[PDB]
């Protein structure tokens, strides 16, 4: 052992004193206590040591610094901080969705069709789409909404049976391209 003893004696004086020592008075303090001429390089040790002391520039020092003892060790260098308390994901529970944005153009007729398609693994067949519309939402509404196969093709995959455009089926297409 050697450098560990130099380390431990500077924390010993500074801890015993509690009130730190000015860097200019440190060398004669060291000479008095440990009977040795402090080399100038040990000042550089004092500047870098995280476990022995802290160099401080109190406002009254002006042109020199105080060596406080190691009580200020390990301030925010835990290297385990992400798991010391591991807080929940959001900024706070009141902010569970930091993101913001708006939905797509989906008027009530599109919404009726889109949910209605969602209710059936069978899809809705060309006649069953009107029947299920009127039954489920308890409405009797314009043929402009329930016979306009094109608007239904905006909300649904429309595909045919018995021939091209001979009989029709609807499956969900549920357009929601909006990301913001």
Supply the DSSP string of 51-86, one letter for each residue. TTEEEE--TTTSS--EEEEGGG-SSS--S-GGGTS-
Half-sphere exposure (CA, 13 Å, Cβ side) for 47? 8
150 and 174 in a single domain? The answer is: yes
CATH number (domain holding residue 26)? 3.30.420.610
2 and 64 in a single domain? The answer is: yes
Please report which helix (H) or strand (E) contains residue 143, including its range: helix 143-146
Please report which helix (H) or strand (E) contains residue 90, including its range: none
CB 113 within 8 A of CB 172: no
114 and 152 in a single domain? The answer is: yes
In the block, which residue shows the tokens 């930091």? 98
CB 107 within 8 A of CB 167: no
85 and 132 in a single domain? The answer is: no
Phi, psi of 158 (to 5 degrees): -110, 130
65 and 114 in a single domain? The answer is: no
**CA–CA gap between residue 18 and residue 24 (Å, rounded):** 17
178 and 141 in a single domain? The answer is: yes
152 and 134 in a single domain? The answer is: yes
**CA–CA gap between residue 23 and residue 165 (Å, rounded):** 94
- Taking residue 154's Cβ as centre, other Cβ atoms within 10 Å add up to 16
Which residues share a beta bridge with 161? 167
Of 9, 44, 79, which residue constitutes the final position of a domain? 79
The contacts found for 3-11 with CB under 8 angstroms, 24 or more apart, are 6/42, 6/45, 7/45, 7/49, 7/51, 7/52, 8/52, 9/33, 9/34, 10/46, 10/49, 10/52, 10/53, 10/67, 11/51, 11/52, 11/53, 11/69, 11/70
| Tokens matching residue 177 | 């391209």
| Tokens matching residue 144 | 């402009």
Phi, psi of 13 (to 5 degrees): -60, -50
Please classify residue 101 by burial: count the beta carbons closer than 10 Å to its beta carbon, then call 0-12 exposed, 13-18 middle and 19+ buried: exposed
What technique was this entry resolved by? NMR
Quote the domain boundaries for residue 91: 80-99
129 contact partners, CB below 8 Å, separation of at least 6: 113, 116, 146, 152, 170
**CA–CA gap between residue 166 and residue 155 (Å, rounded):** 20
- Taking residue 149's Cβ as centre, other Cβ atoms within 10 Å add up to 14
Rounded to the nearest 10 degrees, how much is the dihedral formed by the CA atoms of 54, 60, 64, 69?
A: -20
176 and 110 in a single domain? The answer is: yes
154 and 104 in a single domain? The answer is: yes
How many structural domains compose the chain? 3
| DSSP annotation of 94 | G
């Amino acid at each position: 052992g050697h450098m560990d003893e130099v380390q431990n004696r500077i924390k010993e004086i500074l801890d015993k004193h509690n009130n730190g020592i000015w860097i200019s008075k440190l060398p004669h303090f060291y000479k008095e206590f440990y009977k040795e001429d402090l080399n100038q390089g040990v000042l550089q040790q004092f500047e870098h040591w995280p476990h022995i002391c802290t160099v401080e520039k109190p406002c009254g020092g002006g042109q020199d610094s105080l060596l406080y003892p190691a009580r200020r060790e390990q301030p925010l260098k835990s290297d385990q901080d992400p798991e010391k308390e591991l807080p929940p994901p959001p900024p706070a529970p009141k902010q569970e969705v930091p993101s913001q944005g708006s939905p797509a153009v989906m008027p009530d007729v599109k919404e009726k069709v889109a949910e209605l398609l969602g209710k059936y693994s069978s899809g809705l067949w060309a006649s069953a789409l009107p029947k299920a519309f009127e039954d489920m939402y308890k409405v009797k509404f314009p043929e402009d909404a329930l016979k306009n196969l094109a608007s239904l093709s905006d909300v649904c995959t429309i595909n045919y049976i018995s021939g091209n455009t001979q009989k029709a089926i609807l499956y969900a297409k549920l357009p929601l391209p909006t990301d913001k």
